[PDB]
Amino acid sequence: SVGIVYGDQYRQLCCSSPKFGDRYALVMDLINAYKLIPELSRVPPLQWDSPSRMYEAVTAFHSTEYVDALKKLQMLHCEEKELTADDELLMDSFSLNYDCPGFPSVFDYSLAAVQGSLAAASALICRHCEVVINWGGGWHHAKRSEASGFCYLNDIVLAIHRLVSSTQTRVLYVDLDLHHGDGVEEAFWYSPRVVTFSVHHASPGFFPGTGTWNDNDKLPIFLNGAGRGRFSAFNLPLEEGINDLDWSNAIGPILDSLNIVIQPSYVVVQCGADCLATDPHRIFRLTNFYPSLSGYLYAIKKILSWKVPTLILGGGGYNFPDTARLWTRVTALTIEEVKGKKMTISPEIPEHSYFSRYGPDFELDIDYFPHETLDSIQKHHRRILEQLRNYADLNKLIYDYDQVYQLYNLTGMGSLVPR
Amino acid sequence: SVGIVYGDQYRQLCCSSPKFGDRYALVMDLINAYKLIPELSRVPPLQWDSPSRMYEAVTAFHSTEYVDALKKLQMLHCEEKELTADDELLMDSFSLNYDCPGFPSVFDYSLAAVQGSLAAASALICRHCEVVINWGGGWHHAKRSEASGFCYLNDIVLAIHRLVSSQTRVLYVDLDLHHGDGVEEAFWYSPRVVTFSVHHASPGFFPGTGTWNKLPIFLNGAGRGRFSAFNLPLEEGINDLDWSNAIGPILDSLNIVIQPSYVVVQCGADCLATDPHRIFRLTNFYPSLSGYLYAIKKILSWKVPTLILGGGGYNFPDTARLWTRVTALTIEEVKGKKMTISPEIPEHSYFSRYGPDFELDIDYFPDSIQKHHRRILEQLRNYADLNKLIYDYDQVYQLY
Amino acid sequence: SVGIVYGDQYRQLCCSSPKFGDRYALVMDLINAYKLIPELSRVPPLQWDSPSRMYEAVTAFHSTEYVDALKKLQMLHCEELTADDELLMDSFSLNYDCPGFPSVFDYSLAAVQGSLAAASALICRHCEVVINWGGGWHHAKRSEASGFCYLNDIVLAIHRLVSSTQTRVLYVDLDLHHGDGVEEAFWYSPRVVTFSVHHASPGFFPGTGTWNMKLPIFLNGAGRGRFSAFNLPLEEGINDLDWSNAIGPILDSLNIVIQPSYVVVQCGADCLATDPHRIFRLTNFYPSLSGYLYAIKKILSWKVPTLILGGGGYNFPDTARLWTRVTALTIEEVKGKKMTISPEIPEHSYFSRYGPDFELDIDYFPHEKTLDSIQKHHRRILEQLRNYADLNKLIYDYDQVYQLYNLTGMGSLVPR
Amino acid sequence: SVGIVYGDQYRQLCCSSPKFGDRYALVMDLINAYKLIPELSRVPPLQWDSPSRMYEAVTAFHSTEYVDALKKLQMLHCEEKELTADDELLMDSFSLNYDCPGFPSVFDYSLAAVQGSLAAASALICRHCEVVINWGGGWHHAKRSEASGFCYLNDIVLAIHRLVSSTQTRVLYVDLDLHHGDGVEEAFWYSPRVVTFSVHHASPGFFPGTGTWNLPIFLNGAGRGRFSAFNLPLEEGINDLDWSNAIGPILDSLNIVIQPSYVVVQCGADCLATDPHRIFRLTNFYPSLSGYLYAIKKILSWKVPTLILGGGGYNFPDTARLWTRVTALTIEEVKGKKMTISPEIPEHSYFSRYGPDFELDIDYFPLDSIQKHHRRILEQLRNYADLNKLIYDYDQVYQLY
Ligand SMILES: O=C(NO)c1cccc(-c2cn(CSc3ccccc3)nn2)c1
Ligand SMILES: O=C(NO)c1cccc(-c2cn(CSc3ccccc3)nn2)c1
Ligand SMILES: O=C(NO)c1cccc(-c2cn(CSc3ccccc3)nn2)c1
Ligand SMILES: O=C(NO)c1cccc(-c2cn(CSc3ccccc3)nn2)c1
Ligand SMILES: [K+]
Ligand SMILES: [K+]
Ligand SMILES: [K+]
Ligand SMILES: [K+]
Ligand SMILES: [K+]
Ligand SMILES: [K+]
Ligand SMILES: [K+]
Ligand SMILES: [K+]
Ligand SMILES: [Zn+2]
Ligand SMILES: [Zn+2]
Ligand SMILES: [Zn+2]
Ligand SMILES: [Zn+2]
Known part of the structure; x- marks a missing residue:
């Protein structure tokens, strides 16, 4: 069973923000x-x-004072009067x-x-669905205690906490x-x-600034957790x-190695579509192509x-529209891989009330034309595999060097794997 | 609303230079x-x-080749190898x-x-804050296209450029x-x-400008400037009082005549009597009254x-002592809200750096100007004439 | 007397082209x-x-077949072209x-019509200067139209001047x-x-007036020319200062050696910093002095x-701002009569075209060299002037040209 | 109409290189x-x-640093002194x-x-001309970012880019x-x-080395291409006949399947039997029919x-003889007006270059591989049409061979 989160009120609320507009409805x-x-x-x-039960669920991660302020923010915007100087200071904090x-x-x-991601987590735990999709x-x-980057509550953290607290369990x-x-x-x-594990762009001044190298007389290093973590x-x-191929080759062996060593009981994938070549960020050049294979679809299939x-x-x-094109192909791929049932998608967008948003081509492939020694990242592979070995030793886990080696040897890079 | 620029990443970066160390953290x-x-x-x-958006912002003032060189300099210093002869020449240029x-x-x-000072300017433009402080x-x-005096990128120029481009005068x-x-x-x-800069100048003293230039005179702008x-x-x-009397009437006449839409103040603390430069004798005293606090209040x-x-x-530590009083003064003047600062440094992470006395006051025991005033008043009259500005000449004369 | 060409029908015709719209009216x-x-x-x-007298006047320079085709083009646009007509016009x-x-x-x-009348007013001494902004x-x-120009009024005016009664223009x-x-x-x-001063660079219209590329050389006329x-x-x-210093000594030297009976000045305003070409940075400022006004005054x-x-x-609007200052300066220099121009644009039916400032100075802020000099061009041009004087058996007053260039310590550039 | 690029300055520049001399003037x-x-x-x-507009047009294809270096090379060759070691290294790169x-x-x-080929493309886009010729x-x-084979800037790529970006357009x-x-x-x-689509000689060591087998295979584009x-x-x-039969069915198949909005033809004359290369044996004969004239007429x-x-x-002179006949043929096919050309060269400034016989014909007395190439190219065209969801009559196309 492949699950997907939706509902009438859920659709209305997911389409009520000024930043994301009706994106969820198109998807x-x-x-x-x-x-x-x-x-x-x-x-x-x-x-x-009850309200107390909702509050207890959200403050499993967020502070009580932050949740109180977010609710007050909504109350204030539902009325006409402007904020007082002390209300402004509270929101700014x-x-x-x-x-x-x-x-x-x-x-x-x-x-x-x-609400949607907690429900998704519960449907995995009771084994009602093998995979659940929540595009909201x-x-x-x-x-x-801080909103950031158009994000106010961290549904991912709360969903992971539900999974990891169910009954050794690793996510x-x-x-x-x-x-x-x-x-x-x-x-x-x-x-x-x-x-x-995050793969992302990083460069000076690019949001949010972290996930990359970190005094004055020593080489930079990657922070990678602290204490027991x-x-x-x-x-x-x-x-x-x-592009699709280089991004696929970048994360593919790392993903496979993480699965071998960590042996997770659950996987949680964030599939943000802003790496598409046609995203207005215009930073990465990924596609939704499916024969020349979309990096996203390669990673999800793996x-x-x-x-x-x-x-x-x-x-x-x-x-x-291009986000909907990608996430529709991800959804079809998940059905095929989980159910073993072929899903054939016409290249022409089908009739529906958002059809006119897919112009001028009205096709499912994004409207992009991909075009093309020292840009490699083999030292990152080496650094990450050494970190995985250190994680396994700290946590007394089996480190199956032979299996990780053969994985990397498929592409002639077995020498990067530490023993 | 008084704003102040800070953040966790911002703090780590502002404390990452060899010259200024952990100063921003003490402040x-x-x-x-x-x-x-x-x-x-x-x-x-x-x-x-995007990288392109960052580059477009910084090269509103700096040249692309200089910005490229500064980024390459960081990359080269994140590797063990020494610079090549060609890269040394590049950096020298x-x-x-x-x-x-x-x-x-x-x-x-x-x-x-x-990043800090551009955000500060935007907070003023959209009227979220009446004053914004950035001690970074x-x-x-x-x-x-040139680094100078421990300064690599001119955040002040970029902030002012954002303000004037939002009739607007700064x-x-x-x-x-x-x-x-x-x-x-x-x-x-x-x-x-x-x-308008007030400063020490003397032969051989950095950077050499801001003073008399066959015979010598003061340069003061060019073209329509x-x-x-x-x-x-x-x-x-x-000392505090003479520096205050020197600058006070100039500040008041500039505001009267120019009627600025925004004011930008650089508040470098190396005029303090206890700065290792030991050139001026200003204080952070708040009853003599600190020249800095006199100027900011005005x-x-x-x-x-x-x-x-x-x-x-x-x-x-004395820079922190000064800028803490400047921050409290700004809250008082903007919000109308009394601020009571204990004369004793409160216990906190850096308490031991304020020894051995642990007071908020710094540990200090406290015709040329008339000519400069006449010259500056004449320059201000010339500036207003050239720019068709309205001003009561005998209101601004009586300031001096 | 300073003259200026205008009339009611003249204004209508000068404002009837698609490229220049109502520019002449604003000016x-x-x-x-x-x-x-x-x-x-x-x-x-x-x-x-008569028509024959008009035709004779235009074909003092233009070919009969080109004038005929230009007349036919107007006729056709007053009524589509045949394939033979299109070939004729393309030729x-x-x-x-x-x-x-x-x-x-x-x-x-x-x-x-305007520039020929201007030349005749100079010939009969009715005017000491005549302006034609059309x-x-x-x-x-x-036999060819080029760069929005169909008939060369300048050539026809110069021909009238140089054939009036040792005359040099x-x-x-x-x-x-x-x-x-x-x-x-x-x-x-x-x-x-x-003498033309101009921008030139690869692909920039019209391509001539620069090195012909043995090291490259300047072509400079042929035969008796x-x-x-x-x-x-x-x-x-x-900018204004560098352009003024570039052409000032050359103009003074040309006057000394050529001793012209008439001067004809083309004062195209596309060197302004605010022209959409955005190539030169000249102004109309008059205190830092407009290069145009410097050159006209000289x-x-x-x-x-x-x-x-x-x-x-x-x-x-900025072309009108410049040419209005040129007109006032010409009155001042010729009559000796002070012309004071208010910095605010006066009320008139094109007032709204001078926004958002409504001021006479163009809306430009000049800003800022050792290697960009052109002293070898000065040396080359003075050598050409010496060669012209020798070919034409004219006095070459070395002392006067030398003293002219030594005002800026550049007397060494002058050839003997 | 039929257009042709020329002008006095254009003629001077096209005749200023050491490799091609005054060829353009003879043509x-x-x-x-x-x-x-x-x-x-x-x-x-x-x-x-403006210079900025020129630079923007040329760098639609070429890199800024390459254009900068080509301009610097001209500047350096307008002075007397030799290149520095640093400038030699720059040009080499x-x-x-x-x-x-x-x-x-x-x-x-x-x-x-x-300049000439961009103007030619604009004359087609605005429909002033049905065909435009640029022998420069x-x-x-x-x-x-690389000069090659006496070519410094690629006027063809820049012209094609203007054509495809004019309106979906296919070239x-x-x-x-x-x-x-x-x-x-x-x-x-x-x-x-x-x-x-290029037809050409290829053999080991022959310039530029591409356009042939790479069991080897033909590369044929990448990505959506x-x-x-x-x-x-x-x-x-x-010879004329075998070259004509080799390319004739390919050209017709491409037109039927692609249905192009514009065609751009490069008509280099070094296949002539009398070219000093002496590799192919084509002629300019118009009765044995010139392979060039066969292709252009088609x-x-x-x-x-x-x-x-x-x-x-x-x-x-033989390049002029061929391109003169190409030009006369273009007028005939587009306008439908017969162009009679005397077999003897007319008197004119360059008449002496056509000796000692002064005729318009060039002075020349005139298998399984090609069938294999045809099968391969037809399969590729089928693959191209399938990938691009174009509709075509499979047997109408195969019948052409
Ligand atoms: O996706 C995110 N976090 O994972 C995230 C976080 C912070 C900011 C943004 C964001 C989005 N946009 C608008 S798109 C656009 C981007 C560039 C140019 C023109 C439009 N701008 N910044 C996204
Ligand atoms: O602040 C500045 N510009 O606004 C600036 C610009 C250039 C140089 C310096 C600077 C700082 N120090 C160390 S303090 C010290 C001063 C005197 C003796 C012993 C230590 N030395 N030079 C500061
Ligand atoms: O003045 C001339 N000869 O003396 C002359 C001759 C040929 C062409 C042109 C001309 C004018 N414009 C429009 S202005 C403009 C220029 C650049 C960018 C945007 C608008 N474009 N080309 C002027
Ligand atoms: O046409 C070309 N590319 O399309 C092209 C590209 C590269 C090189 C050449 C070229 C020309 N010549 C001199 S002709 C000659 C040929 C053989 C023997 C004697 C003289 N030699 N090589 C032409
Ligand atoms: K990520
Ligand atoms: K962790
Ligand atoms: K100062
Ligand atoms: K200024
Ligand atoms: K000129
Ligand atoms: K002449
Ligand atoms: K070929
Ligand atoms: K292609
Ligand atoms: Zn994102
Ligand atoms: Zn300082
Ligand atoms: Zn012009
Ligand atoms: Zn060739």
Whole structure:
């Protein structure tokens, strides 16, 4: 069973923010227009039996004072009067400003993603679904008491906490967004049982600034967790311009090696679409092509081949029609891999009420033409495999050198694997 | 609303240089130890959506080749190998040497101050704050294609450029011991940015400008910027009261005549009597009254949106002592809210650096100007004539 | 007497082309709004007593087959072309930047009418200077339209001047572009000395007026006209002061050696810093002094009868701002009568075109060298002037040219 | 109309290089001697309103650093002194050496061909002309940042780029030169909307080395451009008839399947039997029918707006003889007006260069491999149409062979 989170009120709330507009509606209606919905189990967003129960769920990660302020922010925007000087100071102390402003539905909107991702986690735990998709979740930047990067509540952290607390259990978090998954990495910085791995662009002044090299008389180093969590936070920063094949070859062996050594009970994937070549960021050059294979589809197919219960989340993606094109192909691929059932998608966009948003071509492939020794990252592979070996030793896990070696030897790079 | 620039990454980068060490941490922790943080709105440093957007922002003033060299200098210092002869020549061509050497974070460090001061300007433009403080910025010596005086990127120029491009005039006031040459040069041809620096000048003293230039005279701008660059050089040894009487009437007449839309103040603390320069004898005393606090209170009385920046200051505990009082004064004047600072340094992480006395007061025992006033008043009349500005000449004469 | 060409029908025709729109109207109405018109003598455009007399006048330079085709082009646009018609027009470059429109012949002829009348007013001594802001079309060739120019009013005016009763004419071309049509017309003629200052670079219109690439050389005329065509190409970015210092000594030297009976000045405004070409950085400032006003003031100080023409200029309000100052300066220098121009644009029906500032100075902020000098061009040009004087058996007053250049310590550049 | 690029400055620049001498003047003076100029619309070379505009046009393909170096090379060759060691190294890094040395007009000469072919493309886009000829263009070997084979700037790539960006638009490029058209092929390697087709000699060690087997296989494009680059390499000694039958069905198949909006033809004359290469044996005969005239007549029969360019040709009078007949044929096919050309060269300034016989015909007395290439090319065209979701009659196309 492949699950997908949706509902009537859920759709309205996910489409109520000023930044993401109707993106969620385009995504779900394109999935529906390609007749995928009858193949999927609807997973209803979680609801609670009291305000105290909802508050207890959200403050499993976020501070009480931060949740109080976010609810007040919504109350204030639902009325006419402006904020007092002391209300402004309170909101500024939680970064509820700039890129994370208030709007009349800001609390309900943020809470909805939490409701959907917690429901998704519960459907994996009780083995009702082998995979669950939530295209309304994936907000990786929010911190315990701080909004960041259009993210107000961290549905990912709360979903992972539910998985890891169910009954040895380890979770592997994989972050494919253009940006570093800083909020999820920070929440589990001291926790060996949640291993985080983000691949992303990093460069001076590019948001959020972390996930890359860190005094004046020593070579830079990668921080990678602390305390009991030492060696448990992984990062691969990449330069701008990377294409499908080079991104696939960059993360593929690393993903396979993480699965071999960590042996996770659950995988959580953030699948932000802002690495597409047609995203207005224009930083990476990934596609949604499916023969010349989309880096995204290569990575998802590899993750699903492990047969580990998996949560697939959304995230960034600022070309709304092209984000829908990618996530529709991810959804079809998940059905095929899990159910063994061929899913044939017409190259022409089907009739539906958002059809006119797919112009001028009205085709499923994004409108991009890919075009092309010293840009390699073999020293990153070596650094990351040494970190994985250190993680295994610290946590008294089997490090199967022979299997990791043969994996890397498939591409002639077995010498990078440490013993 | 009074804003202040800080953040966790910002703090680590502002403390990553060899010359300034952990100064920014002492400053912000003393402000926090005196319970001033809850009175202030945190302004997060600006971040960009692509490398191209960052480059476009910095090269609004600096040349692309200089920005390229500064980034390569950081990369080269993150590897063990020595520089090649060709790379040494490249860095020399941009003065990335001597007092502006490379180190492993030199580009991220320099850019951080630009991110802070651009966010500060935007907070003023959108009216979120009436005043914004950035003690990580104020690097007034860097030029279009040249590092100078421990300054690599000119965050002040970029901030002012954002302000004027939002009829808009900016008044720039430079209180540092040293002449603010980079900012003056950037706006040498611009009448809408009036610059005014007070500083020590004497033969061989850095950077050499801001003073008399067959016979000698004062240069003061060019083209349509003629008469728009003001300077007051002072002899060594000046105390709070004489420095205050020197600058006070000039500040008041500049505001009256120019009517600025924004004021930008560089508040470098190397004029303190206890700075190792030991050139001027200013204090942080708040009843003699600190020359710094006199100037800031006067500027804030104008009720013009204002950016307050850092700069020099090489006695790090006494720089923190001064800038903590400047921050409290700004809260008082803008919000109308009394601030009571204990004369004893409160216990906190850096308490031991304030020994052996642990007081907030620094440990100190406290016709040339008339001519400069006549010259500056004449220059201001010439500036107003050239720019068709309305001003009661006998109202501004009586200030002096 | 300072004359200026205008009239009611003339204004309509000069404002009838697709490229230049109402520019001539803005120029003359700004001159009128500053109250300069009562100081000037109106010079009416020349009219003829028959079609044959008009045709004879135009074909003093242009070919009969080119004039015939230009007349037919207007006729056709007053009524599609046949394939033979299209071939005919293409053979004369009556296409691309020089297309047809319903008034193309009358429009082109009008500039000729104005500049011929201007020349006659100088010849009979009615005016000491005449201004024609509807003329100055320096690119047109004897059988070819070029660069928005269909008929060469400058060539026809110079021909009238030089054939009036040892007469030599000095032509000075200040336009951004090389004055190739005028230079070509008089290539074999020693009695018309042409001097153009301009931008030149690879691919920039029209391509001539620079090195011909043995090291490259400047071509400078041929036959009896050898050494009589002068050129100074300049790199982009030059400001008022550097342009003034570039051409000032060369102009003074040309006057000393040539001793012209008439000067003709093309004053195209596309060197302004605010022209959309954005190549040179000249201004109209008058205190840091406009290069144009510096050069006009110098030329008028010679006290030689002078024709001042327009030409390029694609920021129409800023072209009017410059040419209004040129007009006031000409009155001041010739009459000795102070002309005070208010910095605020006066009320008139084109007032709204001068926003958002509504001031007379162009809206530009000048800003800022050792290697960009052109002293070898000065040396080359003075050698050419010496060669011209020797070929034509004219006095070469070395002492005077030397003292001129030694005012800036550059007397060593002058050849013996 | 039929347009042709010329002008006095254009003529001077096109005649300023050491390799091609006054070839362009012979071509245009023979066309004029046969009284063809009144039948043709003159297309003036493009000029720009600033250096920045020129640079923007040229760097639509070429790198800024390469254009900077080519301009510097001209500057350096306009002075007396030798190059410094540092400047020699700079020029070497762009292959501005060997067969692409500097000379006093090298940048203005190279830019002139770009000016002409861009103006030719604009005349087709605005529909002033149905066909435009530029015998000063056709420099197919230059790359983004590399000079090659006497080519410094690629006027063909820049012209094709203007054509494809004008409105969906598809361009068919046909390269008849003795050499493989590698620079144009490479520029559009990833682009399905520009289909390139070169017929050429290829053999071990022969310039430039590409356009042939790479069990070896033909590379044919990449990405969305897979199957969009076509090549036909031919053995030395081939005659008019065998070359015509080799390419004739390929050309018709491409037009039927691609349905191009524009055709661009490179017509380098170094396949002539009398070219000093002496590799192929084509003629300019118009009764044995010139392979060049066969191909041009076929392409013009499609009634698609067409650009005809020059290229190689190192026997200058015989190149003029061929291109004069190409020009007369273009007028005939487009206008439907017969062009009678005397078999004897007319009197004109260059008459003495056509001795000792002074005739218009060049002075020349005139298998399983090709069938294998045809099967391969047909399979590639089927793959191209499938990948690009184009509809075509499989047997109507195969019938052509
Ligand atoms: O995706 C994110 N985090 O994972 C995230 C976090 C912070 C900021 C942004 C964001 C989005 N946009 C608008 S798209 C656009 C981008 C560049 C140019 C023009 C439009 N700008 N910044 C996204
Ligand atoms: O602040 C500045 N510009 O605004 C600036 C610019 C250039 C140089 C310096 C500087 C600082 N120090 C160390 S303090 C010290 C001073 C005197 C004796 C012993 C130590 N030495 N030179 C500061
Ligand atoms: O003045 C001339 N000869 O003396 C002359 C001759 C040929 C062409 C042109 C001309 C004018 N414009 C439009 S202005 C403009 C220029 C650059 C960018 C944007 C607008 N474009 N080309 C002027
Ligand atoms: O045409 C070309 N590319 O399309 C091209 C490209 C590279 C080189 C050459 C070239 C020309 N010549 C001299 S002719 C000759 C040929 C053989 C023997 C004697 C003289 N030699 N090589 C032409
Ligand atoms: K990521
Ligand atoms: K962890
Ligand atoms: K100062
Ligand atoms: K200034
Ligand atoms: K000129
Ligand atoms: K002459
Ligand atoms: K070929
Ligand atoms: K192709
Ligand atoms: Zn993102
Ligand atoms: Zn200082
Ligand atoms: Zn012009
Ligand atoms: Zn060839």
